[PDB]
Amino acid sequence: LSVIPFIWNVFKSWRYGELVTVDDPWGYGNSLEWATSCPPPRHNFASLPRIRSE
Amino acid sequence: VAALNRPNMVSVGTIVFLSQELMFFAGLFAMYFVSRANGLANGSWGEQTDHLNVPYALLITVILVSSSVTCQFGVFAAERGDVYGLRKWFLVTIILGSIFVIGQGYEYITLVGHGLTIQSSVYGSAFFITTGFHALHVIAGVMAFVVVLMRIHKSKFTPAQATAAMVVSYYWHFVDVVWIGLFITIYFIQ
Amino acid sequence: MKSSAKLMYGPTVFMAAMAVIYIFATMHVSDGGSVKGVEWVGSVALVLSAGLTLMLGVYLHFTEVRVDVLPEDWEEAEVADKAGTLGFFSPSSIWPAAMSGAVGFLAFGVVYFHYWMIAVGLMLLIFTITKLNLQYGVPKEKH
Amino acid sequence: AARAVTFWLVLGIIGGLGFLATYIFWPWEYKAHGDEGLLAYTLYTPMLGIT
Amino acid sequence: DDQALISEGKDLYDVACITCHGVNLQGVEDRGPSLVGVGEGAVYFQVHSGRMPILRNEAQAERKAPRYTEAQTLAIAAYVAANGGGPGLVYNEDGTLAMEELRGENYDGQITSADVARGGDLFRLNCASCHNFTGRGGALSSGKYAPNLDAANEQEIYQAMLTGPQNMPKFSDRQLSADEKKDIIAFIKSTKETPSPGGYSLGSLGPVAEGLFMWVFGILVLVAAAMWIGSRS
Amino acid sequence: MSLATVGNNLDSRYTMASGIRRQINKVFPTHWSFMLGEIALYSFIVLLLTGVYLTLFFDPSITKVIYDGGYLPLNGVEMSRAYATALDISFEVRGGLFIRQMHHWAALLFVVSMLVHMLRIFFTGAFRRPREANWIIGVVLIILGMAEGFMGYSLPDDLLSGVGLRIMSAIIVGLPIIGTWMHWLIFGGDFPSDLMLDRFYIAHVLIIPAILLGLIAAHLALVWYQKHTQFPGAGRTENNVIGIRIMPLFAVKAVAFGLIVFGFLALLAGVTTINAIWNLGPYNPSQVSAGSQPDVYMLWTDGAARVMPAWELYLGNYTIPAVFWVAVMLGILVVLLVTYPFIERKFTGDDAHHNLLQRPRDVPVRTSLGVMALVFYILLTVSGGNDVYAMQFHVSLNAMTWIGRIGLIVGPAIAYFITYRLCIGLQRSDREVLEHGIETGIIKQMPNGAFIEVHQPLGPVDDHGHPIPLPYAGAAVPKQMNQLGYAEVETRGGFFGPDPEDIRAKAKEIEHANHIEEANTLRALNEANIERDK
Amino acid sequence: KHFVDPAWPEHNPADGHVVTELISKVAGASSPWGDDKEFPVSAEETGYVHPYTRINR
Numbered sequence A: 001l002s003v004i005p006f007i008w009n010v011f012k013s014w015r016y017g018e019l020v021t022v023d024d025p026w027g028y029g030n031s032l033e034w035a036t037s038c039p040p041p042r043h044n045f046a047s048l049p050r051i052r053s054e
Numbered sequence B: 001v002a003a004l005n006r007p008n009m010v011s012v013g014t015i016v017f018l019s020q021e022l023m024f025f026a027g028l029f030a031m032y033f034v035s036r037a038n039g040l041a042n043g044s045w046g047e048q049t050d051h052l053n054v055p056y057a058l059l060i061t062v063i064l065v066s067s068s069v070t071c072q073f074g075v076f077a078a079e080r081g082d083v084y085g086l087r088k089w090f091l092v093t094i095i096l097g098s099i100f101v102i103g104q105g106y107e108y109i110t111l112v113g114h115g116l117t118i119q120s121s122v123y124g125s126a127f128f129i130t131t132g133f134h135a136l137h138v139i140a141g142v143m144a145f146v147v148v149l150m151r152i153h154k155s156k157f158t159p160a161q162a163t164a165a166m167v168v169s170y171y172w173h174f175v176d177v178v179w180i181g182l183f184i185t186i187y188f189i190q
Numbered sequence C: 001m002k003s004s005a006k007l008m009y010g011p012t013v014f015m016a017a018m019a020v021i022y023i024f025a026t027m028h029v030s031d032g033g034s035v036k037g038v039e040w041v042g043s044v045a046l047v048l049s050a051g052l053t054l055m056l057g058v059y060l061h062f063t064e065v066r067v068d069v070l071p072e073d074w075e076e077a078e079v080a081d082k083a084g085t086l087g088f089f090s091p092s093s094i095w096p097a098a099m100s101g102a103v104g105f106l107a108f109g110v111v112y113f114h115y116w117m118i119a120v121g122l123m124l125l126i127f128t129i130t131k132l133n134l135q136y137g138v139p140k141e142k143h
Numbered sequence D: 001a002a003r004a005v006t007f008w009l010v011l012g013i014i015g016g017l018g019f020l021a022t023y024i025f026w027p028w029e030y031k032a033h034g035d036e037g038l039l040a041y042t043l044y045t046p047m048l049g050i051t
Numbered sequence E: 001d002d003q004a005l006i007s008e009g010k011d012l013y014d015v016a017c018i019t020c021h022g023v024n025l026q027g028v029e030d031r032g033p034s035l036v037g038v039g040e041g042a043v044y045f046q047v048h049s050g051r052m053p054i055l056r057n058e059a060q061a062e063r064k065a066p067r068y069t070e071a072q073t074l075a076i077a078a079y080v081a082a083n084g085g086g087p088g089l090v091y092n093e094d095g096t097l098a099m100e101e102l103r104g105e106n107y108d109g110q111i112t113s114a115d116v117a118r119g120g121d122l123f124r125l126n127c128a129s130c131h132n133f134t135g136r137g138g139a140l141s142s143g144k145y146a147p148n149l150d151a152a153n154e155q156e157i158y159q160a161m162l163t164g165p166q167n168m169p170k171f172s173d174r175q176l177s178a179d180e181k182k183d184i185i186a187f188i189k190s191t192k193e194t195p196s197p198g199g200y201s202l203g204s205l206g207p208v209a210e211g212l213f214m215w216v217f218g219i220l221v222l223v224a225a226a227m228w229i230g231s232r233s
Numbered sequence F: 001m002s003l004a005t006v007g008n009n010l011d012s013r014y015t016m017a018s019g020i021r022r023q024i025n026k027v028f029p030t031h032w033s034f035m036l037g038e039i040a041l042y043s044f045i046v047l048l049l050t051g052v053y054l055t056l057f058f059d060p061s062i063t064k065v066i067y068d069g070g071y072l073p074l075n076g077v078e079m080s081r082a083y084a085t086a087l088d089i090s091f092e093v094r095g096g097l098f099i100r101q102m103h104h105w106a107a108l109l110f111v112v113s114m115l116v117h118m119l120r121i122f123f124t125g126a127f128r129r130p131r132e133a134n135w136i137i138g139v140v141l142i143i144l145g146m147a148e149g150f151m152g153y154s155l156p157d158d159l160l161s162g163v164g165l166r167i168m169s170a171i172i173v174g175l176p177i178i179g180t181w182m183h184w185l186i187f188g189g190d191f192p193s194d195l196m197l198d199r200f201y202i203a204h205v206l207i208i209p210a211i212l213l214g215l216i217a218a219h220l221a222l223v224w225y226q227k228h229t230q231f232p233g234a235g236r237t238e239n240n241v242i243g244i245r246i247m248p249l250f251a252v253k254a255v256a257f258g259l260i261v262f263g264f265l266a267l268l269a270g271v272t273t274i275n276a277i278w279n280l281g282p283y284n285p286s287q288v289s290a291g292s293q294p295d296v297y298m299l300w301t302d303g304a305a306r307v308m309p310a311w312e313l314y315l316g317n318y319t320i321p322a323v324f325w326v327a328v329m330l331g332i333l334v335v336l337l338v339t340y341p342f343i344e345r346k347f348t349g350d351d352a353h354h355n356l357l358q359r360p361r362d363v364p365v366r367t368s369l370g371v372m373a374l375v376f377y378i379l380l381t382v383s384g385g386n387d388v389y390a391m392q393f394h395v396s397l398n399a400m401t402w403i404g405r406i407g408l409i410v411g412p413a414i415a416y417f418i419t420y421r422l423c424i425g426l427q428r429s430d431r432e433v434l435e436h437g438i439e440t441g442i443i444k445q446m447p448n449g450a451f452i453e454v455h456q457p458l459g460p461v462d463d464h465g466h467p468i469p470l471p472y473a474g475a476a477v478p479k480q481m482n483q484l485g486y487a488e489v490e491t492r493g494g495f496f497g498p499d500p501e502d503i504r505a506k507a508k509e510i511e512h513a514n515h516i517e518e519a520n521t522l523r524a525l526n527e528a529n530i531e532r533d534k
Numbered sequence G: 001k002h003f004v005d006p007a008w009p010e011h012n013p014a015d016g017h018v019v020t021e022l023i024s025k026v027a028g029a030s031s032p033w034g035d036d037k038e039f040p041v042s043a044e045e046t047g048y049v050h051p052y053t054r055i056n057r
Ligand code: HEC
Pocket: E049, E051, E060, E061, E062, E063, E123, E126, E127, E128, E129, E130, E131, E145, E146, E147, E148, E149, E150, E151, E152, E156, E157, E158, E160, E161, E165, E166, E167, E168, E169, E171, E184
């Protein structure tokens, strides 16, 4: 029974979920994928940050 | 200034693929050697292994290594931008590979002719699985060369086609190496 | 590609050492609850696993001694270093799905072992592979 | 181009001559299961149609 | 000779078949039938063709690689025969199981074609409804099927006709006499072992195979030729 | 040469000079689709000629003989004269087996060629006004071609044919007023009847061939009169045809494709066995085989009888059998196919005089209905062949019948859904190319780090540096750069070496000059169309 | 001397090389149409001919 809310949540959020404005809704994303857009463009990067650490 | 020398991505891809295929052949090697270890207790191996024909094996080995040499001459021709030398040497390699396929086929036909098949013994099963999978690989390699010839016949010879020829050469060299391993295992180390 | 060419040397040497240790161990230790004697399955696998990792490492090192100081590996590179053409990438292609279906037909053929299914599967498979490899080089329509 | 056309033309010539030879001379009468020459009878129609 | 053979028969029976047939061949409630009175022939057919042991209850048993050799098969058959007998194996004039001597009422050294004619009409009368015209097999209800007859030897064919393995009706030696059965064997082996005069046989499944061949690949090659000769725009 | 004298003598009498000029100058488009119909025509030619050769040996008589021919495995077997003479064709005549197999394979190729040709006509929309008459003629042909072929393989009176004849008779007798009367009319009595095989023989060799020949002649004559349709393209309009003249460059290709089909048939007639009657035995009503389906083109009407759920009506002294409903269903299925262009009119809401074809992607409803009918027909076919399918692929026979039943409802819906969405996606890709240009696949990184793919425009570019969208025209849009010439070989010569450099350069120069000249003439032709349309 | 396809890019071997089994001047795969090209190009230089066409009403 536990997977019923999972399926409904994915189905509902895909089609009417809260829209994401910023590039990192969680706020403190460390990895590089959180610097780009949500969703990314077709080629993933409209601009590359200055990468200097992890 | 000219650009950097970067690794050839397709060469890394095909090398990773051949390293993967080496572990495919590891399984057949393990099965063969377990069969041999069991058989050497009864001495039956020493009887079944006497059915084989080592000079014919040497002849087909010579044919296959000649195929490798012709392939690498074709690769040198390719890196020089010469399409016609590539066509020459790759057609010769195709011929030699087909002759090797015929060599193994005639070997099998004679062997079933004089009393060795898959059902005859554990030696039959091990021998035929180990050599037949490599035979399928050789057939696929000849097909790869013919596809390369299709490519360089239809398209203009850019670096994209040269690296394709270079990449198929890697696969054929791996085929030659695993044949050498199989021959040394089956006809010599036996 | 310097660091990844050289980090592969740990796994391969560990596997090779384990292979030799294991061969000596199983061929000598007559422990109860087990049978003495070299086992070829496992030992062959260990040596050829070391072979796989060694092939990767040696090819990568043999290549890396040729390449230059790429900006992706330079610890203080600027985004302007890699400006230019990155390479050619396939935009779209129907042929991966087609040859997946061809392999499926061949596999079903060997399931039931109907010989015509195997033959048609192999033919269809090489056809789809050829169409994949000639996609961006098919000649223009000859008038 | 002339060579490419003439190759198929000579192939067709030998194919048609081979048909006439196979139709006329190849053994064609029925052979039972145990009979010698069953091979020729069971290749008569295939050979002539092939060529 | 048989008295000591029965001992090996019992030893083999105890170690495989009890779980389905009981120690005293009485059968088990849903797991296997009783084997009283089936005889040598049923055991030989079932074991030599490899149908027994059955490791999974299914719509139907399956032929496969046999679990026992010939001598072990005859030993188990001797043990089962000691419990009530039944139909027996067709032993030739020297005492060996008859193989290649069952090919027709008038067999000398080759298949007589008159026997083939009579056996063909017999097979079409009785056997060809469940199998097909040349014995390529056929389907039945609820997942059962009639196998292709190319696998069996002559003794297996005779004992199959005699015993009626699962859904096959019995054909006793007074319904189909030995002459009729041997002519049927002759026809089966003639159809199996004779190449088709008209080229590759397409399995001899009938209109389905010919249809599939043409309507897929034959038209595909001609549209390929059309694309060669025509244009894409 | 005396050829001029022959031509003079002809035209001074018949005055054909005006007319044959007009004939040779007629223009035919060159799409690969537009010779599928020719395949059927060539097959029909072969069907005629090989059939005429088979009639010098076949004897359509149901009366018996004790066989004594060359096929030893049936010596002494009492058989029909039809079956005996078919066996004598197969065994006693040199090459009669080769011919008989060629006739049968030609029948199969003929029917499937008609099927694929009709699929082309349906999807491309060529049935529309004024050409719907050719549809009404053509559908009749593909009905009669099957009706003939069925009774064609019924003639030998072997065991596999007579069961189909039994099925036909038993279906006719079940019709709810006139079934017994119609059966006694057709067969001359109860089945099997003395006059049965001769009525079917004459129906097969004279009647239906005569009708098919007349209707095919009318069909080709109509196609010639109102000129062939064409796909939208550069310089093409509703009021013109672009292609090649019927000679020299088209008639020779027609001859060549005739040769290819002819030889293909002669190959597959000798290399694959078809209808090996010699191991079926003669017909007698008490015997049957597990796999006893009719020919492939009849399997659909077998499958219908397999999937009908046995609904039978009893009314006092009368009964409507359960097989009346498959007759109704198959008749509805045939009516829908026969009357299609008008039920297309009534819902499409147009009656225009179309001469340009629709690409099937641009008409998702009709192509989706076509794939829906294809899956329906295929489910009927495989349900007809499910006895073999269950035996081979090991699926339960009841499960196959229920797959047929429930699938003839469900699978058409899934086919419609998937086909519709795929067509919309195809035309979306076309619009995407036409408004953004081809995606070369060359990816480059800008100084800002942005990854960009250079797109190669087709039309002009705005001053911002981006293409101006083109309006879609129905003609195919190129989707890659190898389809604009950019992968063509720069080298010239054969295998193993090049041509000399002077020949090389001059040949390439002439090649490129022609490539620009044809572009210029098509461009000017299209501009002339724009001017002439206002 | 050996033949060279004119689609081959020009270079000086004395200070480099064009492509080898190990290294190349690209991170990804080389262009099938030649890395030496410079896309995009003009409409008429493309060779395409866009059709104007209308249908009956
Ligand atoms: C349907 C009612 C059948 C008829 C009529 C005949 N047989 Fe049959 N046969 C049938 C089945 C269901 C099976 C499988 C039995 C099993 O337990 O698997 C068989 C099997 C055979 C065999 C064995 C084939 C094999 O590969 O081992 C043979 C040799 C055989 N049948 C022959 C045969 C003959 C000669 C028949 C006419 C006299 C005949 N059978 C009738 C179902 C049916």
